[PDB]
Design an enzyme around this catalytic site. Sequence first.
Site, PDB file in Angstrom:
ATOM      1  N   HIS A   1      -1.498   1.282   7.174  1.00  0.00           N
ATOM      2  CA  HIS A   1      -2.053   1.203   5.799  1.00  0.00           C
ATOM      3  C   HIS A   1      -2.007   2.597   5.141  1.00  0.00           C
ATOM      4  O   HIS A   1      -2.300   3.633   5.763  1.00  0.00           O
ATOM      5  CB  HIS A   1      -3.463   0.572   5.819  1.00  0.00           C
ATOM      6  CG  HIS A   1      -4.109   0.471   4.476  1.00  0.00           C
ATOM      7  ND1 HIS A   1      -3.494  -0.162   3.380  1.00  0.00           N
ATOM      8  CD2 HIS A   1      -5.297   0.943   4.016  1.00  0.00           C
ATOM      9  CE1 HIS A   1      -4.311  -0.112   2.351  1.00  0.00           C
ATOM     10  NE2 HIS A   1      -5.409   0.563   2.706  1.00  0.00           N
TER      11      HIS A   1
ATOM     12  N   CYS B   1       0.847  -1.203   0.000  1.00  0.00           N
ATOM     13  CA  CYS B   1       0.000   0.000   0.000  1.00  0.00           C
ATOM     14  C   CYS B   1       0.885   1.256   0.000  1.00  0.00           C
ATOM     15  O   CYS B   1       0.443   2.258  -0.550  1.00  0.00           O
ATOM     16  CB  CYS B   1      -1.073  -0.053   1.080  1.00  0.00           C
ATOM     17  SG  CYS B   1      -0.373  -0.203   2.735  1.00  0.00           S
TER      18      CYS B   1
END
Length: 346
Positions: free
Chosen positions: A284, A15
């Site tokens: 994330h 990510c």
Amino acid sequence: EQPGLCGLSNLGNTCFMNSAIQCLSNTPPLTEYFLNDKYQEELNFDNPLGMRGEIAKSYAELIKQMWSGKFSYVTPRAFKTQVGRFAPQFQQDCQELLAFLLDGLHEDLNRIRKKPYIQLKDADGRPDKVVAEEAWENHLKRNDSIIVDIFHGLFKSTLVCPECAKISVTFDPFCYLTLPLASKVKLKDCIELFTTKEKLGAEDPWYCPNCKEHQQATKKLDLWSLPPVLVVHLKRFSDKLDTLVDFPINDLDMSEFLINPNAGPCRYNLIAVSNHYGGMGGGHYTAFAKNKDDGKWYYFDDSSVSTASEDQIVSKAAYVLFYQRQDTFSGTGFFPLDRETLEHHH
Ligand SMILES: [Zn+2]
């Protein structure tokens, strides 16, 4: 599907890569350069500092996919594979990857064939304008690329020896600004902190060339010139600062910070944000970006793309901000590709 509204598969803690790619993908003069095949003739296969053209080629191929309008998402396997090959250290820090990519793209596309050695110089009491213009000419003799054209600015560094009074002034390029964070603050508070005099410690002293000895000198940064695209890294990790940094979406006026009296306009609008959720070594990454075709905001969370409202962009999750200078927008003719296209179409 619409060109550029294209998500990216997570390939296993990638990510950080997907977030950095969505910011660069949504840097209009960079994507335009690759979509118009301006890169093939500038690939520098022999550069000892570059990646044999492999990062520029793989990045070009991924951007062409993302902006073809054929895909709701793509799997960036080839690009991830080239990054891993040339930069084995790549959950990561999104800013480190950006730093790597801005340098790698630059060296892959660098128009200088053989870099000359430059006798680095202090101001030597000379006026700023002459030392700054010298620094920039020297930078361009070693570094000349689409990356320089878009992202590179110039900052002045002032080091003061507490013994001998030695004022050491240098002008150094940058391709991003890393800001120290001052519960809530303004982006302009963080810029003011960036340009504040700070004392160096026993950790990382400055060598005084007059004294011939390491000193705990005072270091002050000032901004000489700001690039068309200004990448602003908020120093959250240096475990993680969750400070809410309030930044404008439109009309960031940087002119108060610029010490160059002959500088042009320096008003910026946001075009992308890298977000981070959770803590340092995990969490994330996602991105907000403004699509260059429709002028609307979208939220990119790996393979998912969704409409966003401007009200959601400013949060504590904001980590890297991409701003573009108004005078450089598509249709101004600022960038040679824009000018050529306009002249072609008129
Ligand atoms: Zn000294």
